[PDB]
Structure formats: C-alpha cells, structure tokens
Ligand binder design. Structure first.
Ligand SMILES: CC1=C(O)[C@@](O)([C@@H]2C[C@H]3OC(=O)[C@H](C)[C@@H]4CCC[C@@]5(CC[C@H](O5)[C@H](O)[C@@]5(C)CC(=O)[C@H](O5)[C@H]5C[C@]6(C)CC[C@](O5)(O6)[C@H]5CC[C@](C)(C[C@@H](C)/C=C(C)/C=C/[C@H]3O2)O5)O4)OCC1
Ligand SMILES: Nc1ncnc2c1ncn2[C@@H]1O[C@H](COP(=O)(O)OP(=O)(O)OP(=O)(O)O)[C@@H](O)[C@H]1O
Ligand SMILES: [Ca+2]
Ligand SMILES: [Ca+2]
Ligand SMILES: [Ca+2]
Ligand SMILES: [Ca+2]
Length: 360
C-alpha cells in the first residue's frame, strides 16, 4: 500500500510499512510566462521565473486539476508506481468539506484507478505514530493548525478546533519584522532565506516580556546568520517574536485565541471523564511545532488554565515533521485495518458517498 500525506506546503509520500516517507517535496505547480508546468522540486528550482499555485490551501484541496498533477507526480515521478496496482491511503484535514471527500474518492478510483483506498484524519495518524490511541493533538503545518482530541482511536468531532495561523504566516511575519529592523527581502530567493532563518534560529520564549528585556539590554540572545551571498545579519529578538504569534495571534492582526487557549477549549468540550487522559497526552505534530521551547511554553500555559491538581504532559516527538505520514504507514500496515479499505467493488456499487460510511 501507498501512503500519501498532502499538506498545504509539503507532500509526504511513501510505502506502507516503511519508517519514513521516501518522498518529501513542495506542494506546488509552477507556470512560466506565456511563450508548460512544473511540479514539486522542479518548480521550486525555477520559482523566480514561475508563478506558483498551491493546490492545497489551509489543508483543503482547492485546485483539483493541479492536485491531480501533484498526485500523478507523486505516483509516477516520486514513488515510481502505477496507482492501479496499490491500495492508497490518503490523509485529510480534521475538518474537510463533504464534497471534497467525495471528489478525492472519485478521482482516486476513476482517474487513478486505485484498487482500494482510505482517507484518514492527519492529527489522528500523528497520535498513532506516538504510540497512543487516546490524547489531544496539536497539528500545525504551513497552512493551518488544528486541535484534535481523540479517544480509543477516534477523533471527537464536535471538540475539534481550527486556527488559520500556521507556518507561512510566521514566515511572512518574520520577513515583516526583519524588514522593520532595516533588512530587505523582496525576491523569491530572499523569501526562501527568511524561511530558513525561521527554521534554523527561531525559538519560543518561556516568557515574552522577560525575554524582550534580555534582548534589549544584552547581546546574549543574538545570532549571526550568513546569507548564501556572504551578507551577515544579526537576528535578535526576532528569533522569539516570530513564533510568539502562536500564543498571541494579535501580533499579526488576528483576533483568534492562541494555541494554548484552543487546546484548553478543545479539552473542555470533551466528556469530563476523559479530560485527565487528554491533559496527560498533549502530542505536538507538524513542522510549525518544531520551535525549540514550544513544549515548555505549552506546559506553562496549559498549567495556568487547567485545574491545579491536573497532571499536564506535552509530548513533542523528534520526528513530528513526519508523524502524520508515519501514523499512516502504521495504520495501512495493520492486519485488522484491511477490512477498512474502500475497495473498487465497493466504489463501483456505492459511488463517492461511500467515503462517508467507511472513513471516520
Ligand atoms: C468524518 C469527517 C468529518 O467530520 C468532516 O467532513 C467534517 C464534517 C464537516 O463538519 C462541519 O460542517 C462543521 C465544520 C463541524 C460540524 C460539527 C461541529 C463543528 C466541529 C468544529 C466546530 O463545530 C466549529 O466549527 C468550531 C468551534 C471549530 C473552530 O475552531 C471554530 O468553530 C472555527 C474557527 C474558524 C477559524 C472559522 C470557522 C472554522 O471553525 O475555523 C472552521 C469550520 C469549518 C471551516 C469553515 C473550514 C472548512 C474548510 C471545512 C468545513 C466546512 C468542514 C466541514 C466538515 O468536516 O473552518 O463543526 O471532516 C473530515 C472527516
Ligand atoms: N525547525 C522548524 N522550526 C519552525 N518551523 C518549521 C521547522 N521545520 C519546518 N517548519 C515549518 O513547518 C511547515 C511545514 O510543516 P508540515 O509539513 O507539517 O506542513 P504541511 O503539512 O505542508 O501544511 P498543513 O499541515 O498546514 O497543510 C513550514 O511552514 C515550515 O517552514
Ligand atoms: Ca499537514
Ligand atoms: Ca518573478
Ligand atoms: Ca489576542
Ligand atoms: Ca499543579
């Protein structure tokens, strides 16, 4: 079986039973000026002269014709398989419109002619990858963030929380605040530099004000960053001002609650008798949870919101850029799961609506 985890920013793809995805590449289709399209790494290589479309926006497929290009590029170019020969497990956002679930299903069976398929919620797979079937996942990628409380293997759908804020917003904000410091980032290459700075040097402060005071009065938190061309810039408080936005979205003009508040509110929407287990099993997933210090800050903030006697545990797996995929690999490899696939026969009989009955 194949496991394909389609994100807003990155596709992660591979073979069920493997440790790790074999392919990880940008979820883009690029087009040159009129007077021809490029997908994935090919498009990234030529970004300066292409216009890019991201077929997934905030975790939701929005450009179906380019999504098919991504899927075809995944099967043919990246995995070197004919999808007609392999059951395929795909992933979806924790909140995904009904019409989109049916369309994905229709495309896989009618266009790619898969023998079987399944679609799983991304956060749930991440929980499985941490060795759990109960817990609350915070999954934050390039395009969207969700909180998903999960009990005995299944998400509690009414308690799911969504935040628009994710990694691309953070890159944009780092670019803004570095521009304010006096630097310039106006080309596509310069934007890529900002994303690298974010990934290499940003961290979450335990307390914003205290950290700002340290940065104000000392060079102790400053890091030199060398650009590819040899310019050197000093990144100081921008290191932690950037991801502080996750806890205080007002930094980018969003009125939304922060990720600690959404986690708490999600837990509070669950049966009182499962909350202890959720608080003790807060699992972080996705690239935007990779910031150093994020677990300690979440611990602090959840402790401030939760009952005084509650045990709070935040789990941040080292491999969490890839946990959704890894969970898919686990699930697709389970003998007891093989009854759960939608088969071509089932599709032929029931049509796209079959996904409602088989995938939850
Ligand atoms: C089996 C399966 C499903 O349950 C499902 O196919 C469900 C069934 C649908 O439920 C649905 O039709 C409802 C969404 C679902 C039904 C059960 C109750 C519930 C679950 C979530 C919750 O109420 C409510 O929306 C909350 C509290 C969640 C939340 O963070 C805020 O409102 C906010 C903030 C904002 C920043 C602004 C609004 C939004 O929620 O985000 C979310 C709400 C949905 C959307 C507009 C995003 C679009 C892309 C997704 C939609 C409309 C998805 C709808 C469905 O997904 O953005 O809504 O997801 C995939 C897997
Ligand atoms: N070490 C790091 N520190 C901060 N951010 C990181 C780090 N590594 C990766 N990222 C960010 O994580 C994001 C990509 O993560 P991921 O692959 O989980 O997202 P996705 O699945 O493409 O998006 P989404 O889940 O929102 O649809 C990017 O914004 C990227 O810059
Ligand atoms: Ca993702
Ligand atoms: Ca250009
Ligand atoms: Ca606020
Ligand atoms: Ca306590």
């Amino acid at each position: 079986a194949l496991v394909c985890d389609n994100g807003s920013g990155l596709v992660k793809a591979g073979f069920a039973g493997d440790d790790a995805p074999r392919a990880v590449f940008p979820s883009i289709v690029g087009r040159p000026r009129h007077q021809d399209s490029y997908v994935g790494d090919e498009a990234q290589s030529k970004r300066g002269i292409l216009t890019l479309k991201y077929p997934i926006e905030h975790g939701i497929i929005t450009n179906w014709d380019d999504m098919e290009k991504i899927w075809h590029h995944t099967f043919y170019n990246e995995l070197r398989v004919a999808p007609e020969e392999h059951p395929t497990l795909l992933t979806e956002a924790p909140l995904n419109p009904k019409a989109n679930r049916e369309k994905m299903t229709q495309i896989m069976f009618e266009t790619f002619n898969v023998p079987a398929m399944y679609v799983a919620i991304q956060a749930v797979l991440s929980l499985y990858a941490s060795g759990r079937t109960t817990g609350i996942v915070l999954d934050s990628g390039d395009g969207v963030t969700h909180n998903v409380p999960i009990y005995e293997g299944y998400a509690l759908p009414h308690a799911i929380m969504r935040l628009d804020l994710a990694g691309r917003d953070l890159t944009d904000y780092l670019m803004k605040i570095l521009t304010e410091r006096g630097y310039s980032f106006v080309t596509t290459a310069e934007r890529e530099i900002v994303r690298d700075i974010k990934e290499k040097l940003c961290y979450v402060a335990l307390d914003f004000e205290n950290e700002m005071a340290t940065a104000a009065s000392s060079s102790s938190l400053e890091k030199s960053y060398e650009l590819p061309d040899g310019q050197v810039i000093t990144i100081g408080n921008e290191r932690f001002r950037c991801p502080e936005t996750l806890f205080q979205p007002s930094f980018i003009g969003m009125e939304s609650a922060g990720i600690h508040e959404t986690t708490y509110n999600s837990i509070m929407k669950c049966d009182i008798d499962i909350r202890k287990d959720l608080y003790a099993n807060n699992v972080m997933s996705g690239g935007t949870t990779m910031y150093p210090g994020i677990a300690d800050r979440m611990q602090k903030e959840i402790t401030a919101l939760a009952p005084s006697t509650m045990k709070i545990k935040i789990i941040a797996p080292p491999e969490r850029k890839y946990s959704v995929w890894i969970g898919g690999s686990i699930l697709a490899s389970l003998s007891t799961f093989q009854q759960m696939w939608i088969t071509k026969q089932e599709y032929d009989e029931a049509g796209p609506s079959i996904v409602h009955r088989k995938c939850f």
